[PDB]
Design a protein around this ligand. Structure first.
Ligand SMILES: CCCCCN(C)CCC(O)(P(=O)(O)O)P(=O)(O)O
Ligand SMILES: CCCCCN(C)CCC(O)(P(=O)(O)O)P(=O)(O)O
Ligand SMILES: CCCCCN(C)CCC(O)(P(=O)(O)O)P(=O)(O)O
Ligand SMILES: CCCCCN(C)CCC(O)(P(=O)(O)O)P(=O)(O)O
Ligand SMILES: CCCCCN(C)CCC(O)(P(=O)(O)O)P(=O)(O)O
Ligand SMILES: [Mg+2]
Ligand SMILES: [Mg+2]
Ligand SMILES: [Mg+2]
Ligand SMILES: [Mg+2]
Ligand SMILES: [Mg+2]
Ligand SMILES: [Mg+2]
Ligand SMILES: [Mg+2]
Ligand SMILES: [Mg+2]
Ligand SMILES: [Mg+2]
Lengths: 273, 269
């Protein structure tokens, strides 16, 4: 499809940029940097960089402008996975059939590698060579990423998730959890791409945020459907399917008035379901 | 400078205290862990440095509030992770349960991850850190490079990956030097009066004191400086480091006295 090709292009672009980020400054840091590289260069689909690139092109921006945004979101994503896999959390030996970072290396090294990837995400956005936007915009990007990645966003989601082991969640609570744990970063990816366009305005940003909210949930509902507290458990399988379609429609409706260059976002919304 | 310290401490604690309000109820416990990890009665050396660097260059100290917060937030998150079972495995810090004991291990990992996000948030926030934009960006750049795999986190890995004196110093310069230097650099930037020669002088200062802390702590506890150099020679080196710090400040005006007093204080403990 058009979306499969767009994804492959986004993936190649962000991987080339990311690949350059993992050279140890000196020899004693080689293994730390190898763990960082292992944690990022893992053949991931790069959905968050796709969203950044696509939001940028949806507002008329050349996609290379969003390279730093794309790297930063993926660096936050990657660090999150390394921490999530740790024995204190999900305790997973494998991710996509490969040894998790703490399994490949060791637990200390994985914690640190990921800590350094979070630093690096902020580094790339603050770096005016790598992220050559107007200064006020670089700062806004950093602000939005920090709020999305932190205790009010993604890390908060993780805490909500750990804090409801034992509790039977209803749909509202499930959605609170999801909106933090994954929504915040998906929204930031769209917001930061849009900012990288050089043409953001408040109406277009707010529309793109409605898009991001809808697709972020649509991802979760559809994943649950395909794995068949989950959406099908709550609603039954057919009604979950209906809801996935309702979310796709909300996303497409949010893009009303956008030009043909927003097609990749429209295509993705449909693809998800 | 015990009184200057206590003032820096009260200033930064007031600003930090305001950062730990959970946006909603489901996040209360996370935010409590964050607070517990920061509001721990720490001496706030890094904020003292940021404030004092700012004043050394003629800047009113409140201009450095965000820098002070950011460096302390990085410092605090680093302690939580350093205390974990996979690293130093400490049950206590300053006689109190470590965050992973008071709460739980996942919560401690997460609380600290959110402190690191928050440090960058505070510097990028033009209300809390109201400098010129290019200066905000430069502060963020320097903190990110200092906190990350090329600085502080690198130092942790070097330590775990381990010694002659050169190698000990490589380790220290990453593990603690990078963040001490960033604290001084960020305060200096917050002054609005930074210039390259002064920034370079202040960096020499920070390099010297960072090491002076480590040398003197090893001396007092008697791969340590006394083991490596001999006890009396380590004492000599501590003085040498203090003098390098004071020399780096030669030609700064009287408002740099707090930095001078700290250099002496370190080696007089
Ligand atoms: C540490 C913050 C992570 C926030 C959510 N991540 C996407 C976690 C990764 C997951 O999607 P994954 O299935 O483990 O990949 P989880 O089910 O554990 O939530
Ligand atoms: C080895 C293949 C395992 C399953 C692969 N996907 C389900 C992983 C995607 C995820 O991590 P996510 O939480 O769905 O986004 P999941 O939890 O569904 O697994
Ligand atoms: C990422 C970790 C960087 C932290 C560097 N030090 C401040 C850690 C704390 C120590 O000083 P502490 O004595 O545990 O407080 P350490 O001796 O373990 O280095
Ligand atoms: C295996 C340790 C080699 C690194 C240097 N030290 C001896 C570690 C011990 C410390 O971190 P600790 O706080 O005493 O555990 P120190 O502050 O003495 O450096
Ligand atoms: C780099 C600033 C040093 C400030 C003094 N330290 C807190 C003294 C205590 C130590 O030596 P200790 O291992 O706690 O005894 P640390 O490793 O924490 O530095
Ligand atoms: Mg998980
Ligand atoms: Mg998991
Ligand atoms: Mg999962
Ligand atoms: Mg320790
Ligand atoms: Mg340690
Ligand atoms: Mg200590
Ligand atoms: Mg020491
Ligand atoms: Mg120690
Ligand atoms: Mg010791």
């Amino acid at each position: 499809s058009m979306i499969a090709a767009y994804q492959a292009r986004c993936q190649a672009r962000v991987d080339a940029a990311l690949d350059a980020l993992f050279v140890a400054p000196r020899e004693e840091l080689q293994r730390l940097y190898e763990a960082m590289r292992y944690s990022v260069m893992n053949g991931g689909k790069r959905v968050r960089p796709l969203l950044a690139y696509a939001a940028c092109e949806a507002l008329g921006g050349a996609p290379q402008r969003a390279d730093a945004a794309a790297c930063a979101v993926e660096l936050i994503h990657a660090y999150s996975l390394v921490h999530d896999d740790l024995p204190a959390m999900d305790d997973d030996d494998l991710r996509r059939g490969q040894p998790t970072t703490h399994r490949a290396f060791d637990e200390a090294t994985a914690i640190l590698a990921a800590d350094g990837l979070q630093a690096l995400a902020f580094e790339v956005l603050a770096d005016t060579r790598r992220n050559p936007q107007e200064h006020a915009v670089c700062l806004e990007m950093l602000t939005r990423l920090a709020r999305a990645a932190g205790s009010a966003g993604m890390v908060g989601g993780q805490a909500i998730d750990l804090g409801s082991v034992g509790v039977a969640l209803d749909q509202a609570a499930l959605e609170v959890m999801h909106r933090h744990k994954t929504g915040a970063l998906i929204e930031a990816s769209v917001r930061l791409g849009a900012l990288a366009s050089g043409r953001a305005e408040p109406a277009s940003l707010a529309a793109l945020e409605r898009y991001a909210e809808a697709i972020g949930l649509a991802f979760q509902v559809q994943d649950d459907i395909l794995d068949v507290p989950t959406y099908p458990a709550l609603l039954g399988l057919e009604a979950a399917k209906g809801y996935a379609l309702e979310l796709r429609d909300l996303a497409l409706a949010a893009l009303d008035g956008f030009p043909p260059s927003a097609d990749p976002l429209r295509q993705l919304a449909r693809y998800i379901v």
